[PDB]
């Protein structure tokens, strides 16, 4: 199937409290595999996945040096933006970037990413044509003009179509099967109620990976999406995820409801109902 | 490997 290599970058100023905090986090198929955190005595790029430990010392050295270079460049960008926005030197500000490539099964780029945000709002982004830019405001228009003159889009298309795809292949060779990892959910239904003629049935999905999952409740073939309560998928903290969906039903009709669990690790969707313990 | 970022 398709794969992706993307870096999530963060630069946060802290006037009076020290140098800006800079971070570079790499993801292969939405899984963190490397991280650089400037908040240290001697900051270094590090593996976040055991399979990256294969890379030799020269790799880590080049990545570390490039990261510190990026950090210092962003330090300047933070100042530049205070200027573009006519802002004070005393407030904290954040610059964020999502930069990467998602390639198809045939090894060709499906989509390139080079998008920026300032204080949580879109700043500028490279368009799908990998040739033009979309500035979100007046400030971004200055960067746009500057990048157009420098041929920045061409520079990024090169990286996105070449360098990024090539590195993704390399990383996949060392952690392909690992990324293919799949933990199917284990489900069960709990019964809850406060002295009333109604009861809550909560369908739980535990220990699954990846996070993508769907839970539904059915009353005789029909999905109850109107009054079904559910929580956002959440990390158990051990690499797997959790999620639940609940519905309020009439006391005594618990057996008329069925929960369905859809996950990529399941040979077939799970089907279950409330089971009063023996 | 991440790209070397340009100035804003």
């Amino acid at each position: 199937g398709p794969h992706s290599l993307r870096y999530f970058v963060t630069a946060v100023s802290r006037p009076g409290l020290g140098e800006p905090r800079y971070m570079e986090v790499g993801y292969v198929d939405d899984t963190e595999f490397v991280r650089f955190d400037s908040d240290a005595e001697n900051p270094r790029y590090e593996p976040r996945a055991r399979w990256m430990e294969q890379e030799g010392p020269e790799y880590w050295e080049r990545e570390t040096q490039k990261a510190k270079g990026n950090e210092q460049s962003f330090r300047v960008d933070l100042r530049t933006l205070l200027g573009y926005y006519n802002q004070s030197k005393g407030g904290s500000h954040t610059i964020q970037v999502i930069s990467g490539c998602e390639v198809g099964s045939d090894g060709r780029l499906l989509r390139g990413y080079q998008q920026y945000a300032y204080d949580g709002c879109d700043y500028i982004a490279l368009n799908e044509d990998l040739k033009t830019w979309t500035a979100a405001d007046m400030a971004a228009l200055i960067t746009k003009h500057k990048w157009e003159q420098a041929g920045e889009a061409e520079r990024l298309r090169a990286y996105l179509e070449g360098t990024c795809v090539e590195w993704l292949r390399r990383y996949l060779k060392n952690g392909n099967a690992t990324l293919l990892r799949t933990d199917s959910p284990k489900a069960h239904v709990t019964h809850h109620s406060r002295p009333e003629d109604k009861v809550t049935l909560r369908c739980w999905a535990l220990g699954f990976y990846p996070a993508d999952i769907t839970l539904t409740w059915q009353l005789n073939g029909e999905e109850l999406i109107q009054d079904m309560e559910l929580v956002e998928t959440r990390p158990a903290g051990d690499g797997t995820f959790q999620k639940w969906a609940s519905v309020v039903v009439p006391l005594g009709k618990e057996q008329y409801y069925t929960c369905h669990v859809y996950h990529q690790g399941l040979p077939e969707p799970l089907t279950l109902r409330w089971e009063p313990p023996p | 490997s991440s790209i070397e970022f340009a100035r804003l």
């Binding site: 999530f8 963060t10 946060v12 971070m23 986090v25 963190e32 991280r35 955190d37 904290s92 954040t94 964020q96 999502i98 945000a117 204080d119 949580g120 709002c121 709990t190 809850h192 909560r202 535990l206 929580v231 956002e232 959440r234 990390p235 158990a236 903290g237 051990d238 959790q242 639940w244 | -």
Partner: protein, 99 residues
């Protein structure tokens, strides 16, 4: 622009009284990145609370996981308190064993 943090408090494993577990406090959808997270037991702050590294999602909002070891009892009360620039006052969310 500021985004108010969404919070979830739950155990890593289904809770069983007397059995060691891990209590999580998942905080998402906030901006700016600076945030103060505390976990409480019966109204008092818990000293040993670990924090995951911070990350951000496609919509630019940040997320982080705080967690602490605990052995649930029938009557102990747990909660997660979050202080963030987006809120006038600290937000407290209590752990519900059924959620």
């Amino acid at each position: 622009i500021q985004k108010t943090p969404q919070i979830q408090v739950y155990s890593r494993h289904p809770p069983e009284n007397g059995k060691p577990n891990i209590l999580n406090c998942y905080v998402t959808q906030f901006h700016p990145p600076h945030i103060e997270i505390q976990m409480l037991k019966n109204g008092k702050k818990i000293p040993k609370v670990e924090m995951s590294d911070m990350s951000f999602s496609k919509d630019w909002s940040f997320y982080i996981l705080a967690h602490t070891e605990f052995t649930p009892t029938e009557t102990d009360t747990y909660a997660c308190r979050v202080k963030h620039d987006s809120m006038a006052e600290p937000k407290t969310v209590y752990w519900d064993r059924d959620m």
